[PDB]
Design a protein around this ligand. Structure first.
Ligand SMILES: [Zn+2]
Ligand SMILES: [Zn+2]
Lengths: 363, 363
């Protein structure tokens, strides 16, 4: 396989389906990347069995414990966790702000639990990342135009530093890919300047950053409407941190190819199970004697084998197996959503799928 | 298969190996029964993959949440948790004392979170138990001779009530088995009276009760030396709540056929991993870069796939996957211990195995 080749097989409106080929495997797009030293409560073989082609590696957590240098000495993240397919690593930038006494500078971020663009790229190399994210400065929402422009402009300077660090490391440049991140908050002219700056630098894929920040779906969709067409059409478009199932459908209708979020895993452990008729909270007493699977059509192993009543009891008792089964199902449901999206685009009926999906999911 | 048939295939000294045939499957003896609405952090297929033929069902937990009647309405414990092989259920007697404002009477135990012998047998029927334990009164250690005799005598009256309740329920008597429990603390004459009383009533198997209570291995072995020969030779001998690997080896040398305890699961979640060179605490810093499997010879899936260093990091971070992997390995190690015991007895070299095991395990 090549280092990186994105091929679009079918289109319907702004939606696309196709494949990214990389050394460690093929990624079917639109793709959902489960977030994980683990994808919580799941063995890697189980993540793969649900249909995931690629996972997202949480860099901020790993650079602290067990540390990037240690993981490198132990053979890299793939060997460490036992996942031999592609891994996309975030840059550490967002969580360094959300989770750390930070001091921001043009050089980078200094924090207590210095992360620069150069160090972020090096850490992702040490982890053995297949898709490396440029290191950027997250923009809070809401943001004033001046603050959004300043942060975006710094992020574009850091995008150039990220590109150069990546390219200067021969083994990384020859075996991994690098994505740039569009910033600019909700302002169309800043999104355009960022898209232009990233395209001048040149990346293997382009992320739409700064939209998983509590602005609401109407505003997110409005911003995607003008922001995705600014990105190069022949490269993957990655919406970072999104999202709920209807968000994903709407984002694909607007040209997005790649997705990640913690919602299926986190809310799974919290007792929320996704179904084609909308989410349910399995903790509710009305499931205590319900012998049906979590979802009536889901093909996952959990829905083949256990009832709502059993999982309700496990989650009520705080059982680890409750978290395992809820997470497997939710992750499988997301992958089955992506498969239905990919198939419907391939067959030129994605518009009808989106309408049918929403009618039933919000009924 | 018959309702119950215990067949001894080979003997060496007091040790025996053979099989219990039951409707739901065959149990290889000596047997170890993992303790579990779940065997914590493991799917049933994983418990089976480690080699378990039978699990122990925790009655006290289940009669509270979700309740025995509810589990019966949902189809019984096998269907509920997805384990289709034999299940031995304890009577609820021990945990009603350890975990509950108890009031003991000749009728039974009244408690806040009335459990009589009749109710305990009924609960085990409602759960769909394959091996039903008679309901007895646990004896504290140490115990005076008078108190040990009183408790044993009450337990023998409750053994008769347990037998009659079991036999009066046609579907239970025709499809399940019933074990009686020897009591009498550490006193040889009380152990003899209890063994005689149980044999007069007649049971499918005989448990040695009251020895998982902190008396130490020397005292336990001394009591097993005279207590096991009092039990019928042609029926299984079940040492309740035992124990560490060397305890199990010593108990088999003294005629025990069946074992349960929480140690591999509980201490697994605590970071203790069993190996043929003794237990290790994977949390210790000396494993942070150790690429070897938990144990060098173990055939389990965890030791095929992940390093000590990875599991060390998972347990340090409180990850659910850490508990899953530690538990699978420990449960597999116990089953591999039982297999080595069974094979060595079958081959007339169990004495040499016990000596070799101890030399290496305590080296
Ligand atoms: Zn499912
Ligand atoms: Zn192992």
């Amino acid at each position: 396989r090549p280092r990186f080749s994105f091929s679009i097989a079918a289109r319907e409106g702004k939606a696309r389906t196709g494949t990214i080929e990389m050394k460690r495997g093929v990624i079917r797009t639109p793709a959902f990347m489960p977030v994980g030293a683990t994808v919580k409560a799941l063995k890697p073989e189980t993540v793969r069995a649900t249909g995931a082609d690629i996972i997202l590696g949480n860099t901020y957590h790993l650079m602290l414990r067990p540390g990037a240098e240690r993981i490198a000495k132990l053979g890299g993240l793939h060997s460490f966790m036992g996942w031999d397919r592609p891994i996309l690593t975030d840059s550490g930038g967002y969580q360094v702000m959300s989770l750390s006494l930070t001091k921001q500078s043009e050089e980078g971020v200094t924090f207590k639990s210095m992360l620069s663009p150069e160090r972020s790229i090096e850490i992702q190399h040490l982890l053995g990342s297949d898709i490396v994210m440029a290191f950027d400065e997250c923009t809070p929402y809401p943001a004033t135009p001046s603050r959004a422009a300043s942060s975006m402009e710094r992020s574009m300077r850091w995008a150039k530093r990220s590109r150069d660090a990546f390219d200067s490391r021969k083994e990384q440049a020859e075996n991994a890919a690098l994505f740039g991140i569009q910033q600019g908050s909700v302002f169309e002219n800043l999104r355009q300047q960022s898209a232009d700056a990233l395209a001048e630098i040149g990346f293997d894929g382009y992320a739409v950053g700064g939209l998983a920040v509590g602005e609401g779906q109407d505003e997110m969709f409005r911003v995607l409407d003008f922001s995705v067409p600014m990105l190069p059409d022949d490269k993957p478009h990655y919406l970072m941190g999104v999202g709920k199932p209807d968000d994903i459908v709407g984002a694909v209708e607007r040209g997005i190819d790649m997705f990640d979020c913690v919602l299926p895993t986190r809310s799974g452990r919290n007792g929320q199970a996704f179904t084609w008729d909308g989410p349910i909270n399995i903790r509710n007493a009305r499931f205590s004697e319900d012998l049906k699977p979590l979802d009536s059509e889901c093909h996952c192993a959990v829905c083949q084998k256990w009832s709502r009543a059993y999982i309700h009891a496990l989650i009520r008792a705080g059982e680890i197996l409750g978290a395992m089964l809820m997470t497997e199902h939710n992750i499988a449901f997301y992958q089955q959503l992506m498969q239905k999206i990919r198939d419907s685009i391939s067959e030129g009926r994605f518009s009808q799928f989106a309408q049918d999906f929403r009618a039933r999911y919000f009924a």
